[PDB]
Design a protein around this ligand. Sequence first.
Ligand SMILES: *[C@@H]1O[C@H](CO)[C@@H](O)[C@H](O)[C@H]1NC(C)=O
Ligand SMILES: *[C@@H]1O[C@H](CO)[C@@H](O)[C@H](O)[C@H]1NC(C)=O
Ligand SMILES: [Zn+2]
Ligand SMILES: [Zn+2]
Ligand SMILES: [Zn+2]
Length: 228
Amino acid sequence: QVYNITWEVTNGDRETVWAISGNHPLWTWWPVLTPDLCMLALSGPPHWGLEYQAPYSSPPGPPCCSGSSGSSAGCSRDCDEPLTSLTPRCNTAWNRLKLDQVTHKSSEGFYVCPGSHRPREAKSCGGPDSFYCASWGCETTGRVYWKPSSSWDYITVDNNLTTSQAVQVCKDNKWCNPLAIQFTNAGKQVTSWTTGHYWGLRLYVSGRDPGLTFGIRLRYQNLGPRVP
Ligand SMILES: *[C@@H]1O[C@H](CO)[C@@H](O)[C@H](O)[C@H]1NC(C)=O
Ligand SMILES: *[C@@H]1O[C@H](CO)[C@@H](O)[C@H](O)[C@H]1NC(C)=O
Ligand SMILES: [Zn+2]
Ligand SMILES: [Zn+2]
Ligand SMILES: [Zn+2]
């Protein structure tokens, strides 16, 4: 029986911030989810700079003079200036370029730790305040050089684009920090996806490691004769 399957990704307030739908039999469709890291941050931790923005809103910041469709009045030169001094966050096109730089540099990157579906790793991995990653060993994925993995956790997370592919997307003042979230074989075996599972993500930068939490949940609805 085919259903309209929607895979939703939520911010930490458990509100859908991104979704993908497709007509498939239940528990057969496991697409790479590509939410933007900054969408996870919508209405999230203050670091990212999107606290006041709602799910599904637009990237903040002025248009870059280097935008693909041309330069508009009020365009910022800054999308093209050195990223050296900037904080990796989501409030302008250049801060997001900086965020892309951090998520891609071999010495930095980001790592992800499981929420409530974790075992007795509660013991010190912490709550949402530590983005479930209070200590090393808590992370089960991410793009960082020690390549953390797990045989029980439900997802792998990486950057979806390389910086060369992301640079003009950020200069077009579009969301340009996409994650590529793949379902693992253990994840394809759980059926609790309708209640949804949560993770924390943290950048590996400056001895601070700014983070946020996000969720993944399943929704499905009938199609065809079963729709009344
Ligand atoms: C569900 O599937 C139908 C048919 O493919 C599509 O038109 C509709 O927009 C989808 N809605 C949602 C909320 O997924
Ligand atoms: C993710 O990467 C795939 C493969 O390069 C690409 O087709 C897709 O457009 C990308 N999505 C986002 C949101 O970056
Ligand atoms: Zn910060
Ligand atoms: Zn300026
Ligand atoms: Zn400047």
